[PDB]
Symmetry: C2
Subunit: 511 residues, 2 copies
Amino acid sequence: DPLRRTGRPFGGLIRDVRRRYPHYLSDFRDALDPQCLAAVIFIYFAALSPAITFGGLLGEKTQDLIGVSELIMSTALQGVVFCLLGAQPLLVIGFSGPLLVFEEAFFSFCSSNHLEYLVGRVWIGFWLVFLALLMVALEGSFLVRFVSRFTQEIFAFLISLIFIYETFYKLVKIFQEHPLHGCKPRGQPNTALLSLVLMAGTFFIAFFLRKFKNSRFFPGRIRRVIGDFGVPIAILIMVLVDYSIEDTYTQKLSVPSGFSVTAPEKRGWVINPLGEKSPFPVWMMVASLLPAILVFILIFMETQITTLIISKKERMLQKGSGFHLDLLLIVAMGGICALFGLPWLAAATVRSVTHANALTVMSKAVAPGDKPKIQEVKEQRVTGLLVALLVGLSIVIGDLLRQIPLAVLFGIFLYMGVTSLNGIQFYERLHLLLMPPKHHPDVTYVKKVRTLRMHLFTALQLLCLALLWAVMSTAASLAFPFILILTVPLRMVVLTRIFTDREMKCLDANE
Amino acid sequence: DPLRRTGRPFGGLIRDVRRRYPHYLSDFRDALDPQCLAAVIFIYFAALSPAITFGGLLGEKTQDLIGVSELIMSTALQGVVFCLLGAQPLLVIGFSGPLLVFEEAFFSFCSSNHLEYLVGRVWIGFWLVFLALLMVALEGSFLVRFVSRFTQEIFAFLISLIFIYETFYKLVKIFQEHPLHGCKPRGQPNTALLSLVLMAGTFFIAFFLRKFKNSRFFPGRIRRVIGDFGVPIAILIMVLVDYSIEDTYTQKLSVPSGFSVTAPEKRGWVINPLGEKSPFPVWMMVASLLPAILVFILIFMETQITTLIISKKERMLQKGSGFHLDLLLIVAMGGICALFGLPWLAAATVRSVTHANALTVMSKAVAPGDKPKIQEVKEQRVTGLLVALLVGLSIVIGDLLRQIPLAVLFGIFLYMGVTSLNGIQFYERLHLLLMPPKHHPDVTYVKKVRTLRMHLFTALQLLCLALLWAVMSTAASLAFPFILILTVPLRMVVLTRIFTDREMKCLDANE
């Protein structure tokens, strides 16, 4: 049991280091496989594009103090360090929504109260590193024992739904700004529909080559190699199709050029801990403790729930996981990077899951029957390091990256979001709301519990998911992690009252 | 055995009349079913559109002597009479390609021989009537017992492939006349791509609602009713989607207005056999025997092979089939209609097949295995009569028919062509060329015969299919039925020599 209260200072860190580090050279040896190369090519784009999008937004919201170059550099550095020294190399760390919301709120507060923006973040980072060291010292990371399945399912489903909704909404804007009338360009003809054609074609080629992998055609070796290279093939085909057309205008991928700060006129690489143009007030020196707690809670909840999700016993993870070393590494790197004006980072979730299940291997036939079960996962320390190194070096290239339209990437994002839903009991019980009771499968949670009780459980879970989406839509979206934490007392108090012991054991089974 | 030599003159006609006519009131009673209404709505468009297309071509090739109104009237009249008095009401009769080729060749001959055209098509009809009566008298229709599976498979596969190729090629022309440049309409923007979007959406909604029929969602009654109404729902949805857009131009469905001849200035309803403007030469009155034989061969081969294909024992047809009465009716109606200047007609293979398997009912339950065996076919005399009656009255309406784009219908045609390939052993053995030998199913022609022999049989059949397509591509396309007939001696002479006795029974099994 990794999550045990040892009773000694820093004990969990030592246990994780002793458990994971002996399997070190095997991590580098297990990378010799075409599947790893396919995974690198697939995950490179999925890690590169959100950096550009969120960097554009972040440059817009602030006074161009943090832009796209800084986010790229932070992602590269943190990814390389974490994948060299981490305990779970199947984690992809990058910027997200709640971090952006916090950054814009902090900038608004600093502007209103007449303080610097790049100086308060330094003290926030100092308090973060102090808090992380304190928590790892006392072994406070064993509290993730109480994060049951009832919370992981909600988190995973909500994250995937948000991903899908954002990807779909990014296509309505093209139709809005290039409408169908006929007679930074605006008002072009043949753009809003060519984007839709490219996106749909990419999604459908990806799904067809995914289904072809489990078919009965061609020799097994060739069939499996073609199956695990589906996404690169779809991207290549649609890039060439869009390259053939010469007169129509489509939006391309824009990576900034040169390793430089976005606004060199009023910023440097190193930020003075004290004031840089005016003295820093002393009251803020210790008042920085309050937002540090909020940042710590956000990063902690995201990282720990992601690590729980990708380490289920169904997925064949054999080398072990770490809940103490990973949190310390992530928070320490965030706090140190805040000194250079770089943003804080956290484990992604959709990217982490997509990385984890792009390396799984399935048992082939044994006999005609159901969809195969997972055989192994193939953990290694090379894929994430290569992805981070490539994201860092995407500045020297960029003449090639400007030939890739964005609608091609929208189909890949839709494929990621749709595929990531597999393996979640909430999703599987949502299907059972429609099938008649005689068609239900032979799983444990259908035979041992009545149908109506299972439907009541599903309705109670959907209510919480809708309540969580409502908060994030609301302007008071900084309270989302607290509402997420409140689900633990809910299950520990109310659900135990409503449901009997036998129902609770089967519906919320650990494995 | 329907195909037996009775010996008595006109015996086969009497046997078919005695076999089919007692089950008369049941034919009208078995029509009370929502599946029949769905079939009527589906087949109405599939019977209406080719009449318009071939009428346009036929008006172009001749000097506007036969147009679109005449073809519509001929289709309606012949369909009504045949479905009231026929022996196989699951046959849809309409104009096709080889008939068009013959009409253009005959017009060219009459033009460059200083003879009339409409008058010269009356003696052909008279000779056709005489030949049909002679053949029915001597019971010469029993020769369709030598048409083995080796010829029916080739015919069905070639017809479906040609259908698919024509439907795809009709979409390249839109891109050719409305190219993507950007700045009887021509050179419009947003027209080539909206057509593609509408076509793809129609095809995909049709396939989704076809797969939903065999799923496990919703109650059985509602699921099956929604499943058998897939095509009307797809058509309605995409018609509304295209109706929402206001500024973009798309080609619509247009029918002539009024029950009038296309060229009233130089034509009437009744054609004088002796002559209309100049006396008809006596030599042609007798020499018209040569093209009558060719027309008879065309109509005979098409109708008889279609009737053989839809009446396989796998499809549960219990009321019987007619091989004499149907041929007599079709040829007599063609010969009589030629007196009014109306075209001859023959049974359409894809439309007949799509009519036959739009009324089948599938079994269920047990466990997912082979595609559920066909339970029944639900023959009746109402659907085919209603389709022809609606096609006849499609001119009084036509303000509604002008709101239907053509790209919506292209997806329905693609769905028809793709679906019609199911149930053909040639198609099923084409898959087995790719799967490895350890994955072949448990059928009779895999266990009883060595794999390489089966692949040799498939290669020999593909060679004949390619040779048959090459002829119709060639300008000498009037010799296609003779090349088709020549496959009958091939199996009886050469294939019996190459293959042993045991292989021939299993590969070319009657049932």
